[PDB]
Design a binder for these strands. Structure first.
Lengths: 115, 255, 120, 143, 109
RNA sequence: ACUCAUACUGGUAAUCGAGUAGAUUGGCGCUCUAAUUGGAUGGAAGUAGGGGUGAAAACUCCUAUGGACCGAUUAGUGACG
RNA sequence: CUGCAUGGCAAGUCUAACCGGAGUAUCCGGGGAGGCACAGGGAAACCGACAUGGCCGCAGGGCUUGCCCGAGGGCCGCCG
RNA sequence: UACCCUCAGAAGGGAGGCGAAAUAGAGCAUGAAAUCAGUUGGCGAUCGAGCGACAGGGCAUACAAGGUCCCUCGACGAAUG
RNA sequence: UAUGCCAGCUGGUGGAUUGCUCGGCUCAGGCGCUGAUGAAGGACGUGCCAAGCUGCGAUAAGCCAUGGGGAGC
């Protein structure tokens, strides 16, 4: 990256397939093993740990997804606002860590026997 | 004479010769022109719109109302006459001059007064005091041409360069580098940002066809090859005897 | 213009003054003047001289460089210091005549103008 | 320098406002002729005048040098040793010219010569070149 | 001496105390005539060797770092330190102050 | 006069000290690049007001504000005042 | 184009485009084409010069302290 | 920007709450000058206009970073007829 | 001592200054044609609500297949 417009221009605007990356977080320190991989895509059925801003050290199920926005929710990540309706604050991946993965799928994009 | 050192740092072959353009006179004046000039040929090209402050339709009403002839009509007081000064004068302009981008920003140098301050540059290389005068700190009070062997070309990883720097004595120099990037206050912050991008100069490594990979990363060292060394690397920012190391192969251009 | 020029002039200031003769004082002055003044030299006339002075067992310094554009001194050793001279002047003012020297040398030598010739 | 200082003084250069502008008149040199005090002031650069000298033959199909003076040669020999090659007898001659661009090879005679005495061979030699040559030694050339 | 001030500085606002010459046209102060007071000229003040001196008598100047006090001695003001404005703050002028070590007195703070 | 010195020190000026145009000489600023090298959340740049230096272009400090960048030296660069 | 200050080299000096190398716009090596200088005079044809013969004399040097030698400079002579 | 007071009012204002900061509160860091409100010091409804420079008084404003100053006596004592 | 002058203080007005850079300017390397198979170009349409832009074309911000991608849209 750091080329110029590129590496950025074709970043945010692309694609609904590449986006999987950009939403990736680290595994636990048990999960790193138990299938090698430094990081995962983060799924709705996962678990996380906040490690980072505003909420540090607390986590609940992801309860969210992304797409264009490369963002996800947490459990009660956030709350009160002026509007009066509690809205979670979308954060990361970056700051988050995954300390639990839910693989409903038998094969979760080969998070096993990677090569 | 020059004394070669093996990649052990122990006194080794200790073989000469030195070049003959090492005996060079040494002119910082000449050196300063060529590489400072070189710096000039680095600036980018930009320009002002060819027709900015030219679209007219501004006229000056003649005398009558107390006013100065301009022409200044259209959009209220304004004009494209170059002189758009405060007060009664209006704004709008014209020929700010002259900057057109196509101007071949470059330099002017004679060939002789170029690589004459190349072989001055290298020249005040091997010296002692005006080695450590402008910067560079090395324990080695003795001869500082700093030859090596042909090997050292091969050293893949720096660390190993680090071993053979400590054992030469020059190596304190890398300790005394910016040894970090310092943002530079002042102008340059906006433009090519000197900003954090800055560091002290260091060792300089001269080699043959290749440039040493395991040396380039270092505190403030630059690597070059004999057939390509310029007046800039040697004598970094108009100065003289940067510390330097030459493989004993890349003696020098010697030509 | 820098180091070589500076030291040399300074040295031949502590020559005239510490010792006697004005040469090595005068020479300071010439150098302490525009470059397009000095030398010139051309080893021709650094030989036969208009003045009685010429070749003899004495040096003939020149303020400026010496250059080779002519014959060389005869049997006499007459070789002299000057600010550096290069090319045939040097290695030509050798053998016949004498060997040219740095003039700094002419500064460390007999101080006090000795038999010397201006030979501009 | 002085030029550097521009600000601080109103009007730079000649002091005046409404000072020197396009003047005195005409473009470049005013007409080389009379004008109403525009330009004149009795001249004689030029006088004659069509800049440069040119000869029609002078060009291709024109005679060419090289020319050598009988000074370098004598300086060359015998006083100092030089081109050892092309040395025989007390002395000899031959090409010692920067260019052997042809139509050439004369040797002028100026300076003090023979002195070598030297014998020279080349294309035609000037009269004051035979003398101070043929005198001590020297002679015919490039028949 | 008399506080030089450019004339009518205290008349039209924006004009500042910074003094300059008077306009040549009969402009009161020019043409020295009393009441205008001024016409700064050499000869007023600037005693030598004490042109710029702290009233304390200590040449006191410039400190914008803590290198700014190098071997500066706070005895007879070779360098009598003063921290510039436009210095960071306590953090900065903390290990600036605490210069106190080598005898150097800093003015305020 | 002494001196490398236009750094000191001592000495002479009754026979030196006004000045527009102008000539000469000592004391510039902007962008970005590079080498050497520094500063900043213990508060950078900018801004306002105020202190000091330089003949001067301009440099610098203090206080408030501001809340992340900013320099110096040398060699370059130019949509540089 | 013409000065000036500084610096390299010097009867020489500099490369241009371009080529090779490389640490790849820097830079190191190469390249001397060509330019200016090394002789001028003449429209041209064409011819072709003082590496010093004399005299004053500054600086500087020499001397036994006015007398010598006297570059540069100045005045002639001589030469194309 | 909840709640409360006010108001014709989902306006605006007051109060209050959030945040390191609201002169970060919606075309939303720092926050100069011109300039405005209130206020402090000095002057002021009998007195004259390039608005100041230099000199000297009034009134006005802890420490620090300056440490001096006054009187009698005495020692020294240029020029001063 | 009203009206009022000068300087400051608190608050404002204003948006300079400093710092910041999602934009410019310039140089460099690479690459280089499209259209009657309608660019090409234009018109008018097309959305739950739709004025502009973009995309599409009465199957109208779209339909199908394969591959990629992935828990959101």
């Amino acid at each position: 990256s750091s080329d110029r417009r590129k590496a950025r221009k074709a970043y945010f605007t692309a694609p609904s397939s590449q986006r999987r990356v950009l939403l990736s977080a680290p595994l636990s320190k048990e999960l790193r093993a138990q299938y090698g991989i430094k990081a995962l895509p983060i799924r709705r059925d996962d678990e996380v740990l906040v490690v980072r801003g505003s909420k540090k050290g607390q986590e609940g199920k992801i309860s969210s997804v992304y797409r264009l926005k490369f963002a996800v929710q947490v459990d009660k990540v956030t709350k009160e606002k002026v509007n009066g309706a509690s809205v979670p604050i979308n954060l990361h991946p970056s700051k988050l860590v995954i300390t639990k993965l839910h693989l409903d799928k038998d094969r979760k994009a080969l998070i096993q026997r990677k090569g | 004479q020059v004394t070669v050192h093996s990649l052990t740092g122990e006194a080794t072959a200790n073989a000469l010769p030195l070049p003959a353009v090492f005996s060079a006179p040494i002119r910082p004046d000449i050196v300063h022109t060529v590489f400072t000039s070189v710096n000039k040929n680095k600036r980018q090209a930009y320009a002002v719109s060819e027709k900015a402050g030219h679209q007219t339709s501004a006229e000056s009403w003649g005398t009558g109302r107390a006013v100065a002839r301009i022409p200044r009509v259209g959009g209220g007081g304004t004009g494209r006459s170059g002189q758009g000064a405060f007060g009664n004068m209006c704004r709008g302009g014209r020929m700010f001059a002259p900057t057109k981008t196509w101007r071949k920003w470059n330099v002017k140098v004679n060939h002789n007064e170029k690589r004459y301050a190349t072989a001055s540059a290298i020249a005040a290389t091997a010296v002692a005091s005006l080695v450590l005068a402008r910067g560079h700190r090395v324990e080695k009070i003795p001869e500082i041409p700093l030859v090596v062997s042909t090997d050292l070309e091969s050293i893949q990883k720096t660390k190993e360069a680090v071993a053979a720097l400590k054992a030469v004595g020059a190596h304190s120099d890398l300790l005394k580098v910016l040894k970090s990037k310092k943002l530079r206050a002042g102008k340059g912050k906006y433009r090519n940002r000197r900003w954090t991008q800055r560091r002290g100069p260091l060792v300089v490594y001269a080699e043959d066809n290749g440039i040493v990979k395991a040396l380039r990363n270092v505190p403030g060292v630059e690597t070059a090859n004999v057939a390509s060394l310029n007046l800039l690397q040697l004598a970094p920012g108009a100065h003289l005897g940067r510390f330097v190391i030459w493989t004993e192969a890349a003696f020098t251009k010697l030509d | 213009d820098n180091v070589y020029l500076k030291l040399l002039v300074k040295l031949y200031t502590f020559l005239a003054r510490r010792t006697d003769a004005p040469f090595n004082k005068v020479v300071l002055k010439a150098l302490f003047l525009s470059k397009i003044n000095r030398p010139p030299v051309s080893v021709s006339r650094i030989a036969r001289a208009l003045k009685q002075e010429g070749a003899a067992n004495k040096t003939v310094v020149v303020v400026g460089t010496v250059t080779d554009d002519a014959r060389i001194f005869e049997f006499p050793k007459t070789t002299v210091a000057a600010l550096r001279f290069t090319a045939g002047a040097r290695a030509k003012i050798v053998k016949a005549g004498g060997e040219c020297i740095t003039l700094d040398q002419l500064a460390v030598r007999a101080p006090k103008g000795q038999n010397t010739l201006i030979l501009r | 320098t002085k030029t550097r200082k521009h600000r601080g003084h109103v009007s730079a250069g000649k002091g005046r406002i409404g000072k020197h502008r396009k003047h005195p008149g005409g473009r470049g040199m005013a007409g080389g002729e009379h004008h109403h005090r525009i330009n004149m002031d009795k001249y004689h650069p030029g006088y004659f005048g069509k800049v440069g000298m040119r000869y029609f033959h002078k060009q291709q199909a024109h005679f060419w040098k090289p020319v050598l003076n009988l000074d370098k040669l004598w300086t060359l020999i015998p006083e100092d040793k030089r081109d050892q090659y092309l040395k025989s007898a007390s002395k000899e001659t031959a090409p010692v010219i920067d260019t052997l661009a042809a139509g050439y090879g004369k040797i002028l005679g100026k300076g003090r010569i023979p002195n070598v005495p030297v014998i020279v061979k080349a294309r035609f030699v000037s009269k004051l070149a035979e003398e101070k040559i043929r005198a001590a030694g020297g002679v015919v050339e490039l028949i | 001496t008399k506080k030089f001030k450019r004339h009518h500085s205290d008349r039209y606002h924006r004009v500042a105390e910074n003094w300059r010459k008077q306009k040549g046209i009969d402009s009161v102060v020019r043409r020295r005539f009393r009441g205008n007071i001024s016409q700064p000229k050499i000869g007023y003040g600037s005693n030598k060797k004490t042109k710029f001196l702290s009233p304390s008598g200590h040449k006191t100047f410039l400190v914008a770092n803590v290198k700014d006090l190098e071997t500066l001695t706070m005895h007879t003001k070779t360098y009598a330190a003063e921290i510039a404005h436009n210095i960071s703050a306590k953090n900065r002028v903390v290990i600036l102050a605490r210069a106190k070590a080598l005898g150097i007195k800093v003015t305020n703070p």
